[PDB]
Each structure stands twice: as C-alpha cells, then as structure tokens.
Amino acid sequence: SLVVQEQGSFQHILRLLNTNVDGNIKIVYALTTIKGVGRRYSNLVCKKADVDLHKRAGELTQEELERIVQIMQNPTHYKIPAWFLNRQNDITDGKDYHTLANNVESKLRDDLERLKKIRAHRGIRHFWGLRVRGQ
C-alpha cells in the first residue's frame, strides 16, 4: 500500500483497563492479550469503534481507547447482540454481561462456590479433585 513514515509518535508498551497492551502487534491481537476479549471480540469491537485494524496498535489515539473502554461496558448499546457475550442470561440478575480480565476469575469462583454451597456433583468432584491431585 502506502509507505508513510512517522518520526517517533508510537509507544512500545501501553496500558488500558488496568491491563498491559503491547503496541506493534495489530490492534486486534493487541487487545486479544487481555482476558475476556479474544480475536473475534476485539475484531467486532474494533469494527464498532470504527478503528482501522489494518493500522497497527502504535497508531492509535487515546480518543479511540476511550471508545473501546466505552464499548467494553455497554456492548448492548453499540449493537453487539447477546450471542457474542461470555456471561449472558445470568441467574443472579437476569441480564447479559461481558466479563473483563480480573472479573472472569471472580465469576468463576462465584460459580464453583455456587455449585459447592448447593452441593452438586460438579462442586464435590472439583474440590476433591484439586485437593487430592494437589496433595
């Protein structure tokens, strides 16, 4: 395409949503680095925030980072339907969510402690599992 050259400007290692993002990978696979967002989700989110993904992650303003973090917390208001989300149709609240990087683990513990407090086969097999395999 076009060989366009910029003196400096790009940073090497950035950070968004309290997670580290490295800036020389394409923006899709730079956002994929975090938990809760993969290739396909970062692809759609960067088609929604109207960011050019063929342009690498060293060529992105903070104005695009604010739109990205915006679409992170309102994915149903930027028209990303409920099929696209990790935790959809929750039993606790009855809504649809897309959980982020530090919250996926807390949701996991919430789930396994739900099955343990109820005392299902999954809970007992899971805990006796970890216990006996680790011991």
Binding site: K95, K117, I118, R119, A120, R122
Partner: protein, 127 residues
C-alpha cells in the same frame, strides 16, 4: 434470586412462569411433557410441608426421580434422594433451581489411589 426476582415472588410462581424464566433445557424438557406419577409425588411432598412443626424442618420425602428439575414449588423441602443404594437427605435451597436431583446424589465413592501400603498387600500371593 433466580432471574433477578425476590424469592417469594418466584416461589409463588407457577411452573409455566418458571418455564418462561428458565434456560432452554428446562423449557424443552417441560414442553415435551411430564409423566403422571410425579403428580402423586408432588402431593406427598406438600403433605409433609403441610404437617410440619413451625420454625424447624418439614418431613423428609424419599425420591427416586434423579431426572426431575427443581421447580420453586419444592424449595425448603428435605428430600432423601436415591443414589442407587442409599438415600441422601438434601434440603432444597433457593440456589438449587433448574438442576437435576441426581446431581445432589453422587453415584459413587472416590478412587483413593494414594495408598501404596494396602497396594503392596493387594498383590497376588506367591506361595
């Protein structure tokens, strides 16, 4: 909460509305139908609940249907589920909804492999 609703609202909700709030599995399980025998069982159940001393625990009901999904009508019930050999008294909590009874009645004992002593004496004798 089960769909974001108060526990009493859900408890006092019919099985059709619980089907309206349920995951796909339950909706398809109930839209295909249910047998006539649990209709007796569900009475036995409530009979116990209706002869229970206040502020304690109701009368236990022994079950064999490990395939019956927990519907709000049976919450607070003490239920002795059959595992294949023994009954297990599990008191139904608000959290158990949507789940099969058999999940609260393990079908086997664990495999304790960490015992080399009893494994060095479970050998074939050479004498």
């Amino acid at each position: 909460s089960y769909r974001g609703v108060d526990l009493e609202k859900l408890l006092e909700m019919s099985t059709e509305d619980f089907v309206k709030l349920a995951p796909a599995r339950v909706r398809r399980r109930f839209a295909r139908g249910m047998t006539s025998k649990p209709a007796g069982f569900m009475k036995k159940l409530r009979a116990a609940k209706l002869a229970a001393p206040e502020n304690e625990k109701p009368a236990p009901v022994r079950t064999h249907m490990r395939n019956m999904i927990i519907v709000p009508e049976m919450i607070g019930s003490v239920v002795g589920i059959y595992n294949g050999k023994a009954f297990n008294q599990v008191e139904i909590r608000p959290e158990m909804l949507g789940h099969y009874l058999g999940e609260f009645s393990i079908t086997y004992t664990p495999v304790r492999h960490g015992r080399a002593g009893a494994t060095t004496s479970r050998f074939i004798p050479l004498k």
